[PDB]
Design a binder for these strands. Structure first.
Ligand SMILES: [Mg+2]
Ligand SMILES: [Mg+2]
Ligand SMILES: [Mg+2]
Ligand SMILES: [Mg+2]
Ligand SMILES: [Mg+2]
Ligand SMILES: [Mg+2]
Ligand SMILES: [Mg+2]
Ligand SMILES: [Mg+2]
Ligand SMILES: [Mg+2]
Ligand SMILES: [Mg+2]
Ligand SMILES: [Mg+2]
Ligand SMILES: [Mg+2]
Ligand SMILES: [Mg+2]
Ligand SMILES: [Mg+2]
Ligand SMILES: [Mg+2]
Ligand SMILES: [Mg+2]
Ligand SMILES: [Mg+2]
Ligand SMILES: [Mg+2]
Ligand SMILES: [Mg+2]
Ligand SMILES: [Mg+2]
Ligand SMILES: [Mg+2]
Ligand SMILES: [Mg+2]
Ligand SMILES: [Mg+2]
Ligand SMILES: [Mg+2]
Ligand SMILES: [Mg+2]
Ligand SMILES: [Mg+2]
Ligand SMILES: [Mg+2]
Ligand SMILES: [Mg+2]
Ligand SMILES: [Mg+2]
Ligand SMILES: [Mg+2]
Ligand SMILES: [Mg+2]
Ligand SMILES: [Mg+2]
Ligand SMILES: [Mg+2]
Ligand SMILES: [Mg+2]
Ligand SMILES: [Mg+2]
Ligand SMILES: [Mg+2]
Ligand SMILES: [Mg+2]
Ligand SMILES: [Mg+2]
Ligand SMILES: [Mg+2]
Ligand SMILES: [Mg+2]
Ligand SMILES: [Mg+2]
Ligand SMILES: [Mg+2]
Ligand SMILES: [Mg+2]
Ligand SMILES: [Mg+2]
Ligand SMILES: [Mg+2]
Ligand SMILES: [Mg+2]
Ligand SMILES: [Mg+2]
Ligand SMILES: [Mg+2]
Ligand SMILES: [Mg+2]
Ligand SMILES: [Mg+2]
Ligand SMILES: [Mg+2]
Ligand SMILES: [Mg+2]
Ligand SMILES: [Mg+2]
Ligand SMILES: [Mg+2]
Ligand SMILES: [Mg+2]
Ligand SMILES: [Mg+2]
Ligand SMILES: [Mg+2]
Ligand SMILES: [Mg+2]
Ligand SMILES: [Mg+2]
Ligand SMILES: [Mg+2]
Ligand SMILES: [Mg+2]
Ligand SMILES: [Mg+2]
Ligand SMILES: [Mg+2]
Ligand SMILES: [Mg+2]
Ligand SMILES: [Mg+2]
Ligand SMILES: [Mg+2]
Ligand SMILES: [Mg+2]
Ligand SMILES: [Mg+2]
Ligand SMILES: [Mg+2]
Lengths: 159, 187, 105, 104, 147
RNA sequence: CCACUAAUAGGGAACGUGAGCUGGGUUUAGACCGUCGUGAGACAGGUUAGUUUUACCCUACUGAUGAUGUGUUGUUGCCA
RNA sequence: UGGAGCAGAAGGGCAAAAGCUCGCUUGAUCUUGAUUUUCAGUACGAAUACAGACCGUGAAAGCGGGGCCUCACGAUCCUU
RNA sequence: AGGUAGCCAAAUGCCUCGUCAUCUAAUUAGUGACGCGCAUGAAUGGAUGAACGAGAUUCCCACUGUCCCUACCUACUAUCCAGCGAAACCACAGCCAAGGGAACGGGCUUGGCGGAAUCAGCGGGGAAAGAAGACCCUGUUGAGCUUGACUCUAGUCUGG
RNA sequence: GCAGUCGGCAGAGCGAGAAAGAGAGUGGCGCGGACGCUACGCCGCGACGAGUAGGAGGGCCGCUGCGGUGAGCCUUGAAGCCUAGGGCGCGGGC
RNA sequence: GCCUAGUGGGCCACUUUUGGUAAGCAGAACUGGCGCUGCGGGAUGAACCGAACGCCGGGUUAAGGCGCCCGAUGCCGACG
RNA sequence: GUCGUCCGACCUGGGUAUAGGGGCGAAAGACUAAUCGAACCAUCUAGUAGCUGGUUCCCUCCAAAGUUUCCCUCAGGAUA
RNA sequence: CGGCGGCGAUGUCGGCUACCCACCCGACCCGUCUUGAAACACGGACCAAGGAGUCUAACACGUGCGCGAGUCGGGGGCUACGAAAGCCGCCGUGGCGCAAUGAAGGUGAAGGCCGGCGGCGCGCCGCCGGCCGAGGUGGGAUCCCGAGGCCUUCCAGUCCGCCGAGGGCGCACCACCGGCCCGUCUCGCCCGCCGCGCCGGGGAGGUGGAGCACGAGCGCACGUGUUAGGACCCGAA
RNA sequence: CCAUCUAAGGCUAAAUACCGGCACGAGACCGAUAGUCAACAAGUACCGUAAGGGAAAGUUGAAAAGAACUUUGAAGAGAG
């Protein structure tokens, strides 16, 4: 059997990237985390305090509590056949703001900005994003040149 | 061969009362006709409540019924319960109530009728309001039984305020190991 | 073995209890025999009352019952002395006598 | 008598029989684990929200008038569309009756 | 009724509802509360926390009549007397307040839970709760200690 | 290993073959020695004494009557 | 650019440092709860953010409630 | 204390069928020696040794069906008949080859094929019968025996 | 879905793509009409049907004995038993 | 939401995979099967291919086949 | 059949003595009424068994597990 | 079908089944333990009769009935079946329930508004009076109101019924927030008197509790599950 | 301080108990492999030295009316 150690198998996971060791850049610490904000967990190995467990690395959660140097996050964690909503405490170094929700915020701002105008102009805009449609019927111009003829190559033993 | 699961095809909802009471069965025979041949959903809720067990028809005390008809907009209007109207002795003044119920306890009948109220039964309710217009359907507390204090998270897990099953309660009955920090641990 | 959430029970059936089991199939027979003994006693002491001699008023002790009065064993000797009844003629005219009982009030 | 040590073989089937449910998120989640200083001050704020109740009713009744007065202060083919209008039960009623009123 | 029991439908089935692999053996797990600290420890800790151990003082010869003190709340305080006792006290104007002796009805202490109806009262008890006496003073009334 | 011989090849058939035998050896209980063990005792270490049951069933096999058909019987035959 | 050291196994981490040398110290103190880890989502152990004291240290920002992290440990009954 | 007198591949020597001699045509046997003795040895008795032994071995003379190599005779059976008349055992039963199969089939597949009822024999098969494997392992199953196991105890010694 | 069997006290409707009333008032001869509905019943649509361990439901399946009931059966033949007879039920069984 | 039986010996296969010379060997991951399950096909067959099953009639298929056993080429089948 | 012994630690009848953790033993754990490494009879006792065997009518509907953690746990439980 | 045909009384018609026989295809012997049985795994020669989850107690949950903040006479007593049933209430003693918490001493389950008076320095920090008064937010079955409208020449014009934009009160229940009670901790100022004390009471903030926050229990019966009992039946050394 | 009894002597009915005995009555019991071991010449026959162990076994018919007489055979056994 294995060991139940806390950092078992985290040799590359908690390690720093190549030529990215040493001083933590200080705008990591300057980012505002509100209640309810959606963030991504990624354990930095420079700071050994507040370190999330390896099952939270690469998980995304919702911040429920904010303290001086750390936040509490609600994280979905699958425990065999049930998913638990975790209440974990993790420092500011091991988290980063998720960008998955701030494109939905861009979509709702351009969707309420397309509801509130064009209503006075009477036309109808689209808000539900359709998937990638079949390609429309189009003409392909071969102006002058004939399409180049391809043949399979003879087999030559390379080396 | 069809790829469908058959574990939950059969619904486990009551089609009839389990009681062989012929008076309740004549009431069910009335309200099957009403809940089928009327457009009222009140009659459907009445019929499905006539189906239930005694535990799923908990009694309605007078004071709870007083305060639920006390709310603004519920005047000159009939309290309907598909269970027992029991007396509540911590009640000093009983206003005028028009009540329909399956059973009313004997002192509750005395208090309501001395208050100038009317007690209806469900066959009279059907002739008064065939669709249950001017009704307030009420229920007793369905978690009021003491089994639900035993129900929940297991007592012996953190933040589990579940009553355990004890033969007796006292200082030597389930108070030592998992319940004090001094005796090993506390949850 | 225990199952899930349930009571811890200690049944006192670890002895050989089935020899000393006392059924009550003679209960209406005991009642009917006690009744006939009662009417035989009442017929024997024919003008004297059937229940027995007069019993005094006693206060129950031990605070749960000390508001309640009940029938004691017998009138005490100072009660008979103040009533002016001899303590040997009391039981002959039908008065229960308790020599053991003090008065405190 | 050796035996099998560990597997996770039928487990993914057993987890999916009743489903792997996401945990039940409802609004107003519990405040367990929030900062005690913040929560103590939040309870003081909730304790004294009734203090400025008159300013609420004053500004609410003032905001009712300034907006309720402000609302009323300045205030496909000639065959198939026509047949869909005639065969509409409520719109084409008199126009449908005109056929019999010519047909007599 | 043996005819409504499960054993009638189990006639013709080989293992009688107890399985072919793990049978119905005699006592697989010990008798009674065996192994409550060893191999049934998870059940005993999960459902009966505090079963093992020893807490508090011993009291060798306990007389349960000594600490007898049945309590009453103030919401049932007028249920000890009749209804005409309350309505005559309601209608009279001399301030003649009725007495409720809770020892007479069978209680020793008055705790104060409910609201008490607005009319004076004289309540006799062996003991009083602080909230009970302050509610009787608040409605107007007296608390009388008896023994 | 001796000797003969054309040669003195190797194997299988539940390491063929114990209701076929034998019981010398393993491997019960008796006993001796060496080594080991405080001891009871232990020893792919020696030594001696130590009950080998039943077929009349079915098949297979070997013999022995016969059985169906040529009407019955007998003689002489043929050979698949 | 760490090819050294950081008590040790190994891995991760670390350069006006987390290493080395001084200065001062005792946050290696008292007290609730919450959480993570093993997990049954139980304890122990270990750990993490907080909060309430009382302190240390620094010019201060701060930092500290043991050791840079991952290991170094212990229920009931009894005794003290 | 370091095994003395003695004795030895012994009923005690692994290597080992030890080396030499003798016995034989040929001897892992026998005897006589040799001693480096895995691991001989002195009342846990060492060495010897007449007489004795239903004790364990080796060789020789004599004698013989032990054998080459079997044969014949006699008694009682077996056999047949009259009378009498059981038992073990038995899922159903009973011809094989290969295949696959719980890895060695009477049955299944594919082939070979198959003919009433029987008698005397026979020991290949029925993984034949006999007896809930005595070997081995597991069981929180025992019992006999031992002691430096745990806890006691009769007796005994000693003090008051 | 069906209490709507709403009948000389009659008027026999409510499957029809489109929220609701076959509403009511007042000014401008021959005596007729299937069945149904043990409502724990009856009828109609649609989809489906493997099963060890195990769970549940229905048994007008069966045995014995008791309490009610069948103005039950029975010496003009009960129980039991046998049967190449007639049958019923998916089956237990009758 | 409550109550809850049975189970807590597993085994096989594509792909990944550790020990072993290897194994119808021992050990994991993923998914599907067998166990719990008949049916068509692989002659035969726990697991392979097709396909999962109320009692039947007609039709049609899958995977397999179509000399005869044995339904289907008894096609004037194609090219080697 | 062949054998050991057959004047002496000889053979034998009857009487008597020793009784079950006891007797008796020229010693084999032998004998003690076909029973002996603790006789026989009755009772406690229907002793206990995580271990074998068995477990009685029909139809209908649903339908598994051999995995997690803890246990003097590994042929068993508790827990999910 | 508003179409027809043939055969019939001692030798024929029908009888799916039921007895025997024939043939083609299928088809290994059941029970059991097992990953895997037709197995060269064990039990079973045949037939009849007997033969194994019971009863008591406790607990849990579910369901049925009665009464219900209560409920229950079980023990006692009074008046053939009947040893039954009926009754008792100054026979509810008592059980369980209506109150918890603490080891225990013990304590024990809402408050706000108004009138009067930097004492301090309850503008803040108690008592005299009156009034209102048992919380809130979201969802929430039901129910309430109704801008309008549901035609039979067409304008009115009323009543009834139905539908309805929208807006409401919101059952049970869930989630959250406050509130109250007992233990314990921290901070801090007061209030009381028969004895002014090593007295008694109060507040704010956390926190432990099997609590409260307008009841739901009791008795009986049935069913399952877990036990203690011989404990489904047979079995030791 | 207080409370409560007056030990080291004795007798005493009733309520209470009663699988033995004497005499009864009853039953949602059992119905001859059941119910007691025992429905019957049952603690009997039989077994063991003994202590002890311990069965099987009901039914003609309403009434013996239990088959006179003839005949075969030595008779059992037949035929009338
Ligand atoms: Mg299907
Ligand atoms: Mg299914
Ligand atoms: Mg289901
Ligand atoms: Mg269980
Ligand atoms: Mg009396
Ligand atoms: Mg396993
Ligand atoms: Mg089954
Ligand atoms: Mg079984
Ligand atoms: Mg079961
Ligand atoms: Mg089991
Ligand atoms: Mg059991
Ligand atoms: Mg342990
Ligand atoms: Mg061999
Ligand atoms: Mg042989
Ligand atoms: Mg042999
Ligand atoms: Mg031998
Ligand atoms: Mg031997
Ligand atoms: Mg013979
Ligand atoms: Mg701090
Ligand atoms: Mg350091
Ligand atoms: Mg202990
Ligand atoms: Mg020497
Ligand atoms: Mg020789
Ligand atoms: Mg020699
Ligand atoms: Mg020696
Ligand atoms: Mg020696
Ligand atoms: Mg003969
Ligand atoms: Mg065979
Ligand atoms: Mg065959
Ligand atoms: Mg043979
Ligand atoms: Mg065995
Ligand atoms: Mg054996
Ligand atoms: Mg074990
Ligand atoms: Mg032992
Ligand atoms: Mg099915
Ligand atoms: Mg098992
Ligand atoms: Mg493997
Ligand atoms: Mg294996
Ligand atoms: Mg299995
Ligand atoms: Mg399946
Ligand atoms: Mg299949
Ligand atoms: Mg093949
Ligand atoms: Mg495939
Ligand atoms: Mg077909
Ligand atoms: Mg073919
Ligand atoms: Mg002798
Ligand atoms: Mg021996
Ligand atoms: Mg076991
Ligand atoms: Mg087994
Ligand atoms: Mg065939
Ligand atoms: Mg088996
Ligand atoms: Mg096996
Ligand atoms: Mg089988
Ligand atoms: Mg085989
Ligand atoms: Mg076996
Ligand atoms: Mg057999
Ligand atoms: Mg039978
Ligand atoms: Mg209930
Ligand atoms: Mg009687
Ligand atoms: Mg349970
Ligand atoms: Mg038994
Ligand atoms: Mg049991
Ligand atoms: Mg036994
Ligand atoms: Mg005296
Ligand atoms: Mg005396
Ligand atoms: Mg008999
Ligand atoms: Mg009989
Ligand atoms: Mg008998
Ligand atoms: Mg007879």
């Amino acid at each position: 059997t294995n060991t139940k150690g806390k950092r078992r198998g985290t040799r590359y996971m908690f390690s720093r990237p190549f030529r990215k060791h040493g001083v933590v850049p200080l705008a990591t610490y300057m980012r505002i985390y509100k209640k309810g904000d959606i963030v991504d967990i990624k354990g930095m190995g420079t700071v050994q305090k507040g370190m999330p467990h390896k099952c939270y690395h690469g998980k995304t959660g919702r911040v429920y509590n904010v303290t001086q140097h750390a936040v509490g996050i609600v994280v979905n964690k699958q425990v065999k056949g049930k998913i638990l909503a975790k209440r974990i405490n993790v420092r500011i170094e091991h988290i980063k703001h998720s960008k998955s929700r701030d494109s939905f915020l861009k979509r709702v701002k351009e969707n309420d900005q397309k509801k509130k105008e064009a209503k006075e102009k009477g036309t109808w805009v689209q808000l539900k994003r359709q998937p990638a449609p079949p390609r429309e019927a189009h003409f392909v111009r071969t102006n002058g040149k004939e399409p180049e003829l391809l043949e399979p190559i003879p087999y030559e033993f390379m080396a | 061969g069809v790829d469908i699961r058959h574990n939950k095809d059969r619904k486990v909802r009551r089609k009839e009362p389990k009681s062989q009471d012929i008076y309740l069965r004549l009431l069910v025979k009335l309200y099957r006709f009403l809940a089928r041949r009327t457009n009222s959903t009140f009659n459907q809720v009445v019929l499905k409540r006539l189906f239930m067990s005694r535990t799923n028809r908990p009694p309605l005390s007078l004071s709870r019924m007083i305060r639920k008809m006390k709310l603004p907009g519920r005047e000159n209007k009939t309290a309907v319960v598909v269970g027992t109207v029991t007396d509540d002795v911590r009640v000093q003044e009983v206003p005028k109530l028009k009540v329909c119920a399956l059973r009313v306890t004997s002192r509750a009948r005395s208090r309501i009728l001395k208050a100038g109220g009317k007690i209806l039964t469900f066959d009279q309710l059907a002739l008064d309001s065939p669709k249950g217009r001017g009704t307030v359907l009420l229920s007793g507390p369905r978690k009021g039984r003491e089994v639900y204090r035993h129900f929940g998270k297991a007592p012996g897990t953190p933040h589990s305020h579940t009553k355990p099953y004890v033969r007796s309660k006292g200082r030597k009955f389930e108070r030592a190991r998992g319940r004090r920090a001094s005796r090993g641990y506390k949850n | 073995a225990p199952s899930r959430n349930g009571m811890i029970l200690k049944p006192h059936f670890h002895k050989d209890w089935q020899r000393r089991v006392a059924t009550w199939f003679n209960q209406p027979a005991r009642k009917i025999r006690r009744r006939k003994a009662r009417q035989a006693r009442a017929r024997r002491i024919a003008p004297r009352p059937a229940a027995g001699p007069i019993r005094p008023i006693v206060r129950c002790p031990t605070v749960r019952y000390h508001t309640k009065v009940r029938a004691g064993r017998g009138f005490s000797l100072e009660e008979l002395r103040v009533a002016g009844i001899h303590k040997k003629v009391a039981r002959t005219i039908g008065i229960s006598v308790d020599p053991r009982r003090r008065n405190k009030s | 008598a050796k035996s099998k040590n560990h597997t996770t073989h039928n487990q993914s089937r057993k987890w999916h029989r009743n489903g792997i449910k996401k945990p039940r998120s409802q609004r107003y989640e519990s405040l367990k684990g929030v900062d005690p200083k913040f929560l103590r001050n939040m309870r003081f704020a909730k304790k004294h929200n009734k203090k400025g109740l008159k300013k609420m009713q004053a500004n609410n009744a003032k905001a009712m008038a300034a907006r309720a007065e402000a609302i009323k202060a300045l205030v496909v083919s000639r065959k198939l569309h026509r047949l869909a209008y005639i065969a509409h039960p409520k719109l084409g009623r008199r126009a449908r009756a005109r056929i019999a009123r010519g047909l007599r | 009724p043996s005819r409504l029991r499960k054993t009638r439908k189990l006639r013709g089935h080989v293992s009688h509802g107890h399985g072919r692999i793990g049978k119905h053996r005699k006592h697989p797990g010990g008798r009674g509360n065996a192994g409550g600290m060893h191999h049934h420890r998870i059940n005993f800790d999960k459902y009966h926390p505090g079963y093992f151990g020893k807490v508090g003082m011993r009291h060798y010869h306990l007389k349960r009549n000594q600490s007898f003190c049945p309590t009453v709340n103030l919401d049932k305080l007028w249920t000890l007397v009749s209804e005409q006792t309350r309505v005559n006290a309601a209608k009279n104007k001399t301030g003649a307040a009725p007495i409720i002796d809770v020892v007479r009805s069978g209680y020793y202490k008055v705790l104060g839970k409910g609201k008490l109806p607005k009319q004076p009262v004289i309540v006799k008890a062996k003991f009083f709760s602080r909230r009970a006496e302050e509610k009787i003073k608040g409605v107007g009334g007296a608390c009388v200690l008896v023994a």
